[PDB]
Structure 1
Amino acid sequence: TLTGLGLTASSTFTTAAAAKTMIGTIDTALQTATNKLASLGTSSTGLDTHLTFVG
């Protein structure tokens, strides 16, 4: 969600300086989202390996 990515429902920019700051904010949001999805993918591979072992 937006709060899980470090943003808010009201996040925006009203000036060129605020947009220059928002560049780094969105950079952090994309980085944390890709780290979260990477952990979910590793968890899915771990579930698949455990399913093979259980069989």
Structure 2
Amino acid sequence: TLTGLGLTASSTFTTAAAAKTMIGTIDTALQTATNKLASLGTSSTGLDTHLTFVG
């Protein structure tokens, strides 16, 4: 969710300097989001391997 990326639901840029800061804010949001999704995929693959073992 937006709070999980460091964004807030109210967030916006009202002027060009605020947009210049928002570039870095969005970049950090994308970085942490992709890392969370990668950890999720790794845990899913681990579940698949343990399922084969239990079989």
Tell me the TM-score normalised to structure 2 length.
0.99
Greater than 6 Å deviation, 4+ residue runs: none
| Higher helix fraction (1 or 2) | 2
Per-residue Cα deviation, 1:7-55 (whole angstroms, up to 9, x for no partner): 1010100000000000000000000000000000000000000000000
CA distance in 2, matches of 1:36, 1:4: 10
Q: What residue number does 1:16 align with?
A: 16
Q: Percent identity?
A: 100
Question: Could you list the runs of 5+ residues in structure 1 that have no partner in the other structure?
Answer: none
Indicate the RMSD between aligned Cα atoms, in angstroms: 0.3
Question: Could you list the runs of 5+ residues in structure 2 that have no partner in the other structure?
Answer: none
Number of residue pairs matched by the alignment: 55
